[PDB]
């Protein structure tokens, strides 16, 4: 029928065979799949995967090929238009993540394993910030405190971490016992202080573009005159509502990715853009590393989760990995100041 | 009188004394100076300098202090509002510039002299482009051909240079004799070819923001699918008509500086932003190096120019140096692709 023909034609442009044996080919168990995916888009693709309607040996390769070929765009117009109009626990993360609990992109320039890659990413953040003894650093969105831990331990600085999760506060406090670290449980927008440095990892994606102006105004209010601010965030290559329906429903309900233009426009009145680093391809490597470790760990946590959860989490990790491999989404570290005299040679 | 009081008050906020002896102090020879500068702004400041109405031992320090203090903004409102509403030869350049005739920012990260700094900048451009033997490179705005010369000589690539000056074409052809270099005298917008790499130095500032969309469309048309594009341009920290009246009248009549936001918005539909490097502080060092060499060379060229030209050219070099030292204007190298698989580790 037409649904099968359309789907087969789109997938062949990406080099994907229906019911083939290659790693990125798909095997379809419920023939309603083709109609569902064409009518429901991203949500139907992921929900049908969770429902067991299809299988794929290398979903990461599937999504990389699909996105490289731009099939979400080659879709017939009357499908696209209709679409446009429209939990995780510490038993899992402690096993999937590295010892610093970095649920964020690692830096694989010179590392061959997740743990080393995360230390290199943490070290790079600290070196870009040009930390000196006695400085006070604000970490907006501190999570479990790995970054505060790393930087207080290795540099002679005070750290104030800010989080929204009462659980993360406690684990961060425990992790940083013995260090000059304070973890606050509050809204970052209420901060009225003065820090030598500010760093933010993986919370800007949840701010929403309507609030970017406020975000940079809050950072400006809290940054000392000669201070430096490092922003670490996933990024979109396009300026719009960058929200994937499936990710939004199952993983990140407040997630919306910024574009370069949006960050530039909102930060312009506050800061000079000193350096912009894109290592999105490293997030592919990071996500596949987490996927590997998630699989190894699955026997120990299976009872606290379900098989449907496993399929959902597998789809999440591999689709995102493919989106980064296809260079569809980006990973940025942006260094900002007010124009420090003599400039910055920003570390790599 | 009020003109003197206002001017003295503004200058004191920048640490500048009227008729003082410190290096950045000014000595005023015509008392009409104060009124002229407050009524005529940037143009009156520079034209009164050319007219011999004032002197300063270190104009670069003067402008750095003036711009750091933001005096152009602290000016009383009824002055600002009124304002808002409103040649060089090879005998000079061959002596002022380096052997590669780079009338563009050098890279002083590891160099202690202009010649080494320009080679490091040329080498960095080539390394960011990740040149491989047999590639064809387009240089939009090739000038006297130093960059084509450098890259054809050191990498096994073909270069097509594009310029608007019939004189620069000839000198570029002579410089590159024996190399696989073609210098075209034409409008870049007429190019319809396919290059492995494209590079553009110091012509984007003359495109004008109304034509940024066309510029990136032309680059896209001429770049092979897996190609890489490097944009090198002076930059403004603000999105507007970034035109200084004095520079516009005496040096760069078509000059208008882009902001990050403008480059981001115009390039977005065409390219992934792979890397953004800001070394504006190095342009201060570059400009002062040129100023030094201009002074040494002055006896040999004085007859072909005038003393008024010398004052104009001195003001130009030192005011720009101060604007870069104050971090008011920036120097960017931006690397673009369409999303090359595995990303780019962009050289520093
Ligand atoms: C909003 C995110 C919030 C992130 C918060 C970051 C916090 C840091 C901690 C962990 C993050 C790790 C994982 C990051 C994943 C990034 C989220 C993401 O994937 O973004 C989606 C792409 O979705 C996809 O990759 C799904 C693939 C697209 C499916 C299309 C298939 C339909 C067409 C097929 C027709 C045959 C939106 O991307 P757009 O720019 O709209 O494209
Ligand atoms: C448009 C430029 C086109 C450049 C083309 C590049 C080609 C490459 C080759 C050579 C370039 C070398 C020199 C580069 C100089 C850059 C041009 C420039 O200075 O830009 C001016 C600043 O002017 C100043 O620095 C002047 C100082 C400001 C004077 C204000 C004084 C009035 C207030 C004092 C009251 C007491 C505009 O800057 P805005 O962003 O508007 O600030």
Coordinates of N, CA, C and O in Angstrom, one line a residue, chain B residues 15-128:
Chain B
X15 N 40.7 59.3 33.4 CA 42.1 59.5 33.9 C 42.9 60.3 32.9 O 44.2 60.1 32.9
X16 N 42.3 61.2 32.2 CA 43.1 62.0 31.2 C 43.0 63.5 31.7 O 41.9 64.0 31.9
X17 N 44.2 64.1 31.7 CA 44.3 65.5 32.1 C 44.5 66.3 30.9 O 45.2 66.0 30.0
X18 N 43.8 67.5 30.9 CA 44.0 68.5 29.8 C 45.2 69.3 30.1 O 45.3 69.9 31.2
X19 N 46.2 69.3 29.2 CA 47.4 70.0 29.3 C 48.3 69.4 30.4 O 49.1 70.1 31.0
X20 N 48.1 68.1 30.7 CA 49.0 67.4 31.6 C 50.2 66.8 30.8 O 50.4 66.9 29.6
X21 N 51.1 66.1 31.6 CA 52.3 65.6 31.1 C 52.4 64.1 31.0 O 53.4 63.5 30.5
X22 N 51.4 63.4 31.5 CA 51.3 62.0 31.5 C 51.2 61.5 30.0 O 50.8 62.3 29.1
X23 N 51.6 60.3 29.7 CA 51.7 59.9 28.3 C 50.3 60.0 27.5 O 50.3 60.4 26.4
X24 N 49.2 59.7 28.2 CA 47.9 59.8 27.6 C 47.2 61.1 27.7 O 46.1 61.3 27.2
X25 N 47.8 62.0 28.4 CA 47.2 63.4 28.5 C 47.3 64.1 27.2 O 48.0 63.7 26.3
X26 N 46.4 65.1 27.0 CA 46.3 65.8 25.8 C 46.8 67.3 26.1 O 46.6 67.8 27.2
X27 N 47.4 67.9 25.1 CA 47.7 69.3 25.1 C 46.9 70.0 24.1 O 47.0 69.6 22.9
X28 N 46.2 71.0 24.4 CA 45.3 71.7 23.6 C 45.8 73.0 23.1 O 46.2 73.9 24.0
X29 N 46.0 73.2 21.8 CA 46.6 74.4 21.2 C 45.5 75.4 20.7 O 45.8 76.6 20.6
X30 N 44.3 75.0 20.4 CA 43.2 75.8 20.0 C 42.0 75.6 20.9 O 41.4 74.5 20.9
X31 N 41.7 76.6 21.7 CA 40.6 76.4 22.7 C 39.2 76.1 22.1 O 38.3 75.7 22.8
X32 N 39.0 76.4 20.8 CA 37.8 75.9 20.1 C 37.7 74.4 20.1 O 36.6 73.9 19.7
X33 N 38.7 73.7 20.4 CA 38.7 72.2 20.4 C 37.5 71.6 21.2 O 36.8 70.7 20.8
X34 N 37.3 72.2 22.5 CA 36.3 71.5 23.3 C 34.9 71.6 22.7 O 34.2 70.6 22.6
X35 N 34.5 72.7 22.3 CA 33.2 72.9 21.6 C 33.2 72.0 20.4 O 32.2 71.3 20.1
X36 N 34.2 72.0 19.5 CA 34.2 71.2 18.3 C 34.0 69.7 18.6 O 33.2 69.1 17.9
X37 N 34.7 69.2 19.5 CA 34.6 67.8 19.8 C 33.3 67.4 20.4 O 32.7 66.3 20.1
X38 N 32.7 68.3 21.3 CA 31.4 67.9 21.8 C 30.3 68.1 20.8 O 29.3 67.3 20.8
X39 N 30.4 69.0 19.9 CA 29.4 69.1 18.9 C 29.6 68.1 17.7 O 28.6 67.6 17.2
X40 N 30.8 67.8 17.4 CA 31.1 67.0 16.2 C 31.5 65.6 16.5 O 31.7 64.8 15.5
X41 N 31.7 65.2 17.7 CA 32.0 63.8 18.0 C 33.3 63.3 17.4 O 34.3 64.0 17.3
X42 N 33.2 62.0 17.0 CA 34.4 61.3 16.5 C 35.0 62.1 15.4 O 36.2 62.2 15.3
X43 N 34.2 62.6 14.4 CA 34.8 63.4 13.3 C 35.5 64.6 13.8 O 36.6 64.9 13.3
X44 N 34.9 65.4 14.8 CA 35.6 66.6 15.3 C 36.9 66.2 16.0 O 37.9 67.0 16.0
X45 N 36.9 65.1 16.8 CA 38.1 64.7 17.5 C 39.2 64.4 16.5 O 40.4 64.9 16.7
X46 N 39.0 63.6 15.5 CA 40.0 63.3 14.5 C 40.4 64.4 13.6 O 41.6 64.6 13.3
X47 N 39.4 65.2 13.1 CA 39.7 66.2 12.2 C 40.5 67.4 13.0 O 41.4 68.0 12.4
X48 N 40.1 67.6 14.2 CA 40.9 68.6 15.0 C 42.3 68.1 15.2 O 43.2 68.9 15.3
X49 N 42.5 66.8 15.4 CA 43.8 66.3 15.5 C 44.6 66.6 14.2 O 45.7 67.1 14.3
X50 N 44.0 66.2 13.1 CA 44.7 66.5 11.8 C 45.0 68.0 11.6 O 46.0 68.3 11.1
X51 N 44.1 68.8 12.1 CA 44.3 70.3 12.0 C 45.3 70.8 13.0 O 45.6 72.0 12.9
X52 N 45.9 70.0 13.8 CA 46.9 70.4 14.7 C 46.4 71.2 16.0 O 47.1 71.9 16.6
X53 N 45.1 71.0 16.3 CA 44.5 71.7 17.4 C 44.9 71.0 18.8 O 44.7 71.7 19.8
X54 N 45.4 69.8 18.8 CA 45.8 69.2 20.0 C 46.9 68.1 19.7 O 47.0 67.7 18.5
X55 N 47.6 67.7 20.7 CA 48.7 66.7 20.7 C 48.5 65.8 21.8 O 47.9 66.1 22.8
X56 N 49.1 64.6 21.7 CA 49.1 63.5 22.7 C 50.3 62.6 22.4 O 50.5 62.2 21.2
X57 N 51.0 62.3 23.4 CA 52.2 61.4 23.3 C 51.9 60.0 23.0 O 52.6 59.3 22.3
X58 N 50.7 59.5 23.6 CA 50.4 58.1 23.3 C 48.9 58.1 23.0 O 48.0 57.7 23.9
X59 N 48.5 58.3 21.8 CA 47.1 58.3 21.4 C 46.5 56.9 21.6 O 45.3 56.9 21.8
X60 N 47.3 55.9 21.5 CA 46.7 54.5 21.7 C 46.3 54.4 23.2 O 45.2 53.8 23.4
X61 N 47.0 54.9 24.1 CA 46.6 54.9 25.5 C 45.5 55.8 25.7 O 44.5 55.5 26.5
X62 N 45.5 57.0 25.1 CA 44.3 57.9 25.2 C 43.0 57.2 24.8 O 42.0 57.2 25.5
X63 N 43.0 56.5 23.6 CA 41.8 56.0 23.1 C 41.4 54.7 24.0 O 40.2 54.5 24.2
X64 N 42.4 54.0 24.4 CA 42.0 52.8 25.3 C 41.3 53.3 26.6 O 40.3 52.8 27.0
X65 N 41.9 54.4 27.2 CA 41.2 54.9 28.4 C 39.9 55.5 28.1 O 38.9 55.3 28.8
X66 N 39.8 56.3 27.0 CA 38.5 56.9 26.6 C 37.5 55.9 26.4 O 36.3 56.0 26.9
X67 N 37.8 54.8 25.7 CA 36.8 53.8 25.3 C 36.5 52.9 26.5 O 35.3 52.5 26.7
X68 N 37.5 52.5 27.3 CA 37.2 51.8 28.5 C 36.2 52.5 29.4 O 35.2 51.9 29.9
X69 N 36.4 53.8 29.6 CA 35.4 54.6 30.4 C 34.1 54.8 29.7 O 33.2 55.4 30.3
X70 N 34.0 54.5 28.4 CA 32.8 54.7 27.7 C 32.4 56.1 27.5 O 31.2 56.4 27.6
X71 N 33.3 57.0 27.3 CA 33.0 58.4 27.3 C 32.0 58.8 26.1 O 31.2 59.7 26.2
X72 N 32.2 58.1 25.0 CA 31.2 58.3 23.9 C 29.8 58.1 24.3 O 28.9 58.6 23.6
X73 N 29.6 57.4 25.4 CA 28.2 57.1 25.9 C 27.9 58.1 27.1 O 26.7 58.5 27.2
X74 N 28.8 58.3 28.0 CA 28.6 59.2 29.1 C 28.4 60.7 28.6 O 28.1 61.5 29.4
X75 N 28.5 60.9 27.3 CA 28.3 62.3 26.8 C 26.9 62.7 27.1 O 26.0 61.9 27.2
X76 N 26.6 64.0 27.4 CA 25.3 64.5 27.6 C 24.4 64.1 26.4 O 24.8 64.2 25.3
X77 N 23.1 63.8 26.7 CA 22.2 63.2 25.8 C 22.0 64.1 24.5 O 22.0 63.6 23.4
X78 N 21.8 65.4 24.7 CA 21.6 66.3 23.5 C 22.7 66.3 22.6 O 22.6 66.8 21.5
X79 N 23.9 65.9 23.0 CA 25.0 65.7 22.1 C 25.0 64.4 21.3 O 25.0 64.4 20.1
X80 N 24.8 63.3 22.0 CA 24.7 62.0 21.4 C 23.6 62.0 20.3 O 23.9 61.6 19.2
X81 N 22.4 62.4 20.7 CA 21.3 62.3 19.8 C 21.6 63.0 18.4 O 21.4 62.4 17.4
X82 N 22.1 64.2 18.5 CA 22.5 65.0 17.3 C 23.4 64.2 16.4 O 23.3 64.2 15.2
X83 N 24.3 63.4 17.0 CA 25.4 62.7 16.3 C 24.7 61.5 15.6 O 24.9 61.3 14.4
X84 N 24.0 60.7 16.4 CA 23.4 59.5 15.8 C 22.7 59.8 14.5 O 22.8 59.0 13.5
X85 N 21.9 60.9 14.5 CA 21.2 61.2 13.2 C 22.1 61.3 12.0 O 21.9 60.7 11.0
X86 N 23.3 61.9 12.2 CA 24.3 62.0 11.2 C 24.8 60.6 10.9 O 25.0 60.2 9.8
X87 N 44.9 58.6 -0.3 CA 44.9 57.1 -0.5 C 46.3 56.5 -0.2 O 47.3 57.2 -0.2
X88 N 46.4 55.2 -0.1 CA 47.6 54.5 0.3 C 48.2 53.8 -0.8 O 47.6 53.2 -1.7
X89 N 49.6 53.9 -0.9 CA 50.4 53.3 -2.0 C 51.3 52.2 -1.5 O 51.6 52.0 -0.3
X90 N 51.9 51.5 -2.5 CA 52.8 50.4 -2.2 C 54.1 50.9 -1.6 O 54.7 50.1 -0.9
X91 N 54.5 52.1 -1.8 CA 55.7 52.6 -1.1 C 55.5 52.5 0.4 O 56.4 52.2 1.2
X92 N 54.2 52.8 0.9 CA 53.9 52.8 2.3 C 53.7 51.3 2.8 O 54.4 50.9 3.7
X93 N 52.9 50.6 2.1 CA 52.6 49.2 2.6 C 53.8 48.3 2.6 O 53.9 47.5 3.5
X94 N 54.6 48.3 1.5 CA 55.7 47.4 1.5 C 56.7 47.6 2.7 O 57.3 46.7 3.1
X95 N 56.7 48.8 3.2 CA 57.6 49.1 4.4 C 56.8 48.8 5.7 O 57.4 48.4 6.6
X96 N 55.5 49.1 5.7 CA 54.8 49.0 7.0 C 54.5 47.5 7.3 O 54.6 47.0 8.4
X97 N 54.0 46.8 6.3 CA 53.6 45.4 6.4 C 54.8 44.5 6.4 O 55.9 44.9 6.3
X98 N 54.5 43.2 6.6 CA 55.5 42.1 6.7 C 55.7 41.6 5.3 O 55.1 42.0 4.3
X99 N 56.7 40.7 5.1 CA 57.0 40.2 3.7 C 55.8 39.5 3.0 O 55.8 39.5 1.8
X100 N 54.8 39.0 3.7 CA 53.6 38.5 3.0 C 52.5 39.6 2.8 O 51.4 39.2 2.4
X101 N 52.8 40.8 3.1 CA 51.9 41.9 2.8 C 50.5 41.7 3.4 O 49.5 41.7 2.8
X102 N 50.5 41.3 4.7 CA 49.2 41.1 5.4 C 48.7 42.3 6.1 O 49.2 42.8 7.1
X103 N 47.8 43.0 5.4 CA 47.1 44.1 6.0 C 45.9 43.7 6.8 O 44.7 43.9 6.4
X104 N 46.2 42.9 7.8 CA 45.2 42.2 8.6 C 45.8 41.7 9.9 O 47.1 41.8 10.0
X105 N 45.0 41.3 10.9 CA 45.5 41.0 12.2 C 46.5 39.8 12.1 O 46.3 38.8 11.5
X106 N 47.6 40.0 12.9 CA 48.5 38.9 13.1 C 48.2 38.1 14.4 O 47.3 38.5 15.1
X107 N 48.9 37.0 14.6 CA 48.7 36.2 15.8 C 49.9 36.1 16.6 O 50.9 35.4 16.3
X108 N 49.8 36.7 17.8 CA 51.0 36.9 18.7 C 51.1 35.9 19.8 O 51.8 36.2 20.8
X109 N 50.4 34.8 19.7 CA 50.4 33.9 20.9 C 51.8 33.4 21.2 O 52.1 33.3 22.4
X110 N 52.6 33.2 20.2 CA 54.0 32.7 20.4 C 55.0 33.4 19.6 O 56.1 33.0 19.5
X111 N 54.7 34.6 19.1 CA 55.6 35.4 18.3 C 55.9 36.7 19.0 O 55.1 37.2 19.7
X112 N 57.1 37.2 18.8 CA 57.5 38.5 19.4 C 57.9 39.5 18.4 O 58.5 40.5 18.7
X113 N 57.5 39.3 17.1 CA 57.7 40.3 16.1 C 56.7 40.1 15.0 O 56.1 39.1 14.8
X114 N 56.4 41.2 14.3 CA 55.4 41.2 13.3 C 55.5 40.1 12.2 O 54.5 39.4 11.9
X115 N 56.7 39.9 11.7 CA 56.9 38.9 10.7 C 56.5 37.5 11.1 O 55.8 36.8 10.4
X116 N 57.0 37.1 12.3 CA 56.7 35.8 12.8 C 55.2 35.7 13.2 O 54.6 34.7 13.0
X117 N 54.6 36.8 13.7 CA 53.2 36.8 14.0 C 52.3 36.6 12.8 O 51.3 35.9 12.9
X118 N 52.7 37.2 11.7 CA 51.9 37.0 10.4 C 52.1 35.6 9.9 O 51.1 35.0 9.4
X119 N 53.3 35.0 9.9 CA 53.4 33.6 9.5 C 52.6 32.7 10.4 O 51.9 31.8 9.9
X120 N 52.5 32.9 11.7 CA 51.7 32.1 12.6 C 50.3 32.3 12.3 O 49.5 31.3 12.4
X121 N 49.8 33.5 11.9 CA 48.4 33.7 11.5 C 48.1 33.0 10.2 O 47.1 32.3 10.0
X122 N 49.0 33.1 9.2 CA 48.9 32.3 8.0 C 48.9 30.8 8.2 O 48.1 30.1 7.6
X123 N 49.8 30.3 9.0 CA 49.8 28.9 9.3 C 48.6 28.5 10.0 O 48.0 27.4 9.7
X124 N 48.1 29.3 10.9 CA 46.8 28.9 11.6 C 45.7 28.8 10.6 O 44.9 27.9 10.7
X125 N 45.5 29.8 9.7 CA 44.5 29.7 8.7 C 44.6 28.3 8.0 O 43.6 27.6 7.8
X126 N 45.8 28.0 7.5 CA 46.0 26.8 6.7 C 45.6 25.5 7.6 O 45.0 24.6 7.1
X127 N 46.1 25.5 8.8 CA 45.8 24.3 9.7 C 44.3 24.2 10.0 O 43.8 23.1 10.2
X128 N 43.6 25.4 10.2 CA 42.2 25.3 10.5 C 41.5 24.7 9.3 O 40.5 24.0 9.4

